[PDB]
Design an enzyme around this catalytic site. Structure first.
Site, PDB file in Angstrom:
ATOM      1  N   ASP A  25      -9.941  -4.362  37.129  1.00 34.65           N
ATOM      2  CA  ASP A  25      -9.624  -2.988  38.503  1.00 34.65           C
ATOM      3  C   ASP A  25      -9.346  -3.386  39.668  1.00 34.65           C
ATOM      4  O   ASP A  25     -10.082  -3.534  40.804  1.00 34.65           O
ATOM      5  CB  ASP A  25     -10.739  -2.001  38.849  1.00 34.65           C
ATOM      6  CG  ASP A  25     -10.435  -0.734  39.115  1.00 34.65           C
ATOM      7  OD1 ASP A  25      -9.486  -0.434  39.783  1.00 34.65           O
ATOM      8  OD2 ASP A  25     -11.973   0.324  38.905  1.00 34.65           O
ATOM      9  N   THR A  26      -7.628  -3.531  39.796  1.00 31.01           N
ATOM     10  CA  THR A  26      -7.517  -3.532  41.212  1.00 31.01           C
ATOM     11  C   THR A  26      -7.736  -2.680  42.129  1.00 31.01           C
ATOM     12  O   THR A  26      -6.777  -2.729  43.319  1.00 31.01           O
ATOM     13  CB  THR A  26      -6.003  -3.696  40.843  1.00 31.01           C
ATOM     14  OG1 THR A  26      -5.276  -2.177  40.230  1.00 31.01           O
ATOM     15  CG2 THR A  26      -5.279  -4.504  39.447  1.00 31.01           C
ATOM     16  N   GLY A  27      -7.993  -1.108  41.579  1.00 29.31           N
ATOM     17  CA  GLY A  27      -8.398  -0.136  43.134  1.00 29.31           C
ATOM     18  C   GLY A  27      -9.882  -0.800  43.254  1.00 29.31           C
ATOM     19  O   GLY A  27     -10.359   0.614  44.714  1.00 29.31           O
TER      20      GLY A  27
HETATM   21  C1  LIG Z   1     -16.380  -2.143  47.408  1.00 29.43           C
HETATM   22  O1  LIG Z   1     -16.288  -1.741  45.433  1.00 29.43           O
HETATM   23  C2  LIG Z   1     -15.826  -0.508  45.671  1.00 29.43           C
HETATM   24  C3  LIG Z   1     -15.220   0.578  45.617  1.00 29.43           C
HETATM   25  C4  LIG Z   1     -15.280   1.746  44.666  1.00 29.43           C
HETATM   26  C5  LIG Z   1     -14.972   1.806  43.431  1.00 29.43           C
HETATM   27  S1  LIG Z   1     -14.714   2.677  42.816  1.00 29.43           S
HETATM   28  O2  LIG Z   1     -15.197   3.658  43.161  1.00 29.43           O
HETATM   29  O3  LIG Z   1     -15.081   2.643  41.385  1.00 29.43           O
HETATM   30  N1  LIG Z   1     -12.720   2.832  42.448  1.00 29.43           N
HETATM   31  C6  LIG Z   1     -12.549   2.651  43.501  1.00 29.43           C
HETATM   32  C7  LIG Z   1     -11.186   3.783  44.109  1.00 29.43           C
HETATM   33  C8  LIG Z   1     -10.889   5.482  43.753  1.00 29.43           C
HETATM   34  C9  LIG Z   1     -10.261   3.559  45.089  1.00 29.43           C
HETATM   35  C10 LIG Z   1     -12.138   2.037  41.861  1.00 29.43           C
HETATM   36  C11 LIG Z   1     -10.916   2.708  40.765  1.00 29.43           C
HETATM   37  O4  LIG Z   1     -10.735   2.353  39.393  1.00 29.43           O
HETATM   38  C12 LIG Z   1     -12.441   3.886  39.622  1.00 29.43           C
HETATM   39  C13 LIG Z   1     -13.457   3.401  38.589  1.00 29.43           C
HETATM   40  C14 LIG Z   1     -14.040   3.527  37.229  1.00 29.43           C
HETATM   41  C15 LIG Z   1     -15.214   2.818  37.581  1.00 29.43           C
HETATM   42  C16 LIG Z   1     -16.328   3.250  36.337  1.00 29.43           C
HETATM   43  C17 LIG Z   1     -15.252   4.046  35.364  1.00 29.43           C
HETATM   44  C18 LIG Z   1     -14.839   4.722  35.507  1.00 29.43           C
HETATM   45  C19 LIG Z   1     -15.635   5.968  36.511  1.00 29.43           C
HETATM   46  C20 LIG Z   1     -16.224   5.143  37.594  1.00 29.43           C
HETATM   47  C21 LIG Z   1     -17.051   4.314  37.103  1.00 29.43           C
HETATM   48  C22 LIG Z   1     -14.843   5.110  38.837  1.00 29.43           C
HETATM   49  C23 LIG Z   1     -13.851   4.576  36.750  1.00 29.43           C
HETATM   50  N2  LIG Z   1     -11.683   5.350  38.886  1.00 29.43           N
HETATM   51  C24 LIG Z   1     -11.230   6.325  39.699  1.00 29.43           C
HETATM   52  O5  LIG Z   1     -11.911   6.622  40.133  1.00 29.43           O
HETATM   53  O6  LIG Z   1     -10.969   7.042  37.907  1.00 29.43           O
HETATM   54  C25 LIG Z   1     -10.573   8.623  38.683  1.00 29.43           C
HETATM   55  C26 LIG Z   1      -9.125   8.794  38.533  1.00 29.43           C
HETATM   56  O7  LIG Z   1      -8.881   9.378  37.486  1.00 29.43           O
HETATM   57  C27 LIG Z   1      -9.203   8.655  36.348  1.00 29.43           C
HETATM   58  O8  LIG Z   1      -9.980   7.831  35.527  1.00 29.43           O
HETATM   59  C28 LIG Z   1     -10.769   7.874  34.805  1.00 29.43           C
HETATM   60  C29 LIG Z   1     -12.180   8.103  36.305  1.00 29.43           C
HETATM   61  C30 LIG Z   1     -12.138   8.932  36.372  1.00 29.43           C
HETATM   62  C31 LIG Z   1     -10.546   9.365  37.381  1.00 29.43           C
HETATM   63  C32 LIG Z   1     -15.388   0.322  42.900  1.00 29.43           C
HETATM   64  C33 LIG Z   1     -15.398  -0.677  44.295  1.00 29.43           C
END
Ligand SMILES: COc1ccc(S(=O)(=O)N(CC(C)C)C[C@@H](O)[C@H](C[C@]23C[C@H]4C[C@H](C[C@H](C4)C2)C3)NC(=O)O[C@H]2CO[C@H]3OCCC[C@H]32)cc1
Ligand SMILES: [Cl-]
Ligand SMILES: [Cl-]
Ligand code: NA
Ligand code: NA
Ligand code: NA
Lengths: 99, 99
Positions: A25-27
């Site tokens: 996860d690059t995000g």
């Molecule tokens: C400081 O370090 C940290 C602080 C925050 C995080 S974060 O919250 O997880 N996030 C950070 C982003 C939102 C800036 C990573 C993101 O990549 C998640 C990752 C993630 C990781 C697990 C599995 C799923 C649901 C959540 C838990 C969020 C995807 N994806 C997601 O919000 O995606 C939505 C969009 O498109 C849709 O796809 C399906 C999911 C929901 C939306 C991680 C480490």
């Protein structure tokens, strides 16, 4: 390898003696693992994303094997349904985004 | 480009004639942008982020330029800590992860 983004980029990891599936996860700034025990010291942290924040435990100097590549770094443990390999460890395996 | 991950992979996007900053996010299935005006009709969507579920507005077939690459696809509008470009548009610009 070259991993396609047609599907979620999921790989096998080994952490604390356990095999798990995790998302590259690059995000994600940091690596976040579902609830498990890890040895050593930890301290609480809040991390935020869509829908707000969760409380996690921050463990420093933890080794993870990611798709066969060993890396060390901080690992956060908390209530996530999916294990997340964040940038802090993606850098250590040499991962890049290419287009 | 080949983008390393020592810092956040932020790029400029152009949507509705306006430049914005966004995060290339391989952990996102969908693209989510902060409140803005887009043309046409929207449909409801619930997305589950790390902190919980939120309602967003789903706009389909939106023209968007990402780091100079043209895409036309779905954009979700709602409260996100940062604008994120997810796999629905990363695939349009030809992005892969490599290590
Ligand atoms: C400081 O370090 C940290 C602080 C925050 C995080 S974060 O919250 O997880 N996030 C950070 C982003 C939102 C800036 C990573 C993101 O990549 C998640 C990752 C993630 C990781 C697990 C599995 C799923 C649901 C959540 C838990 C969020 C995807 N994806 C997601 O919000 O995606 C939505 C969009 O498109 C849709 O796809 C399906 C999911 C929901 C939306 C991680 C480490
Ligand atoms: Cl680290
Ligand atoms: Cl490097
Ligand atoms: Na430690
Ligand atoms: Na509007
Ligand atoms: Na539309």
């Amino acid at each position: 390898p070259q991993i396609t983004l047609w599907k979620r980029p999921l790989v096998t990891i080994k952490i604390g003696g356990q095999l798990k599936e995790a998302l590259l996860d690059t995000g994600a700034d940091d690596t976040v693992i579902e609830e498990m025990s890890l040895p050593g010291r930890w301290k609480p942290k809040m991390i935020g994303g869509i829908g707000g924040f969760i409380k996690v435990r921050q463990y420093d100097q933890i080794i993870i094997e990611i798709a066969g590549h060993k890396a060390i770094g901080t690992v956060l443990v908390g209530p996530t349904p999916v294990n997340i390999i964040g940038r802090n460890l993606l850098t250590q395996i040499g991962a890049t985004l290419n287009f």
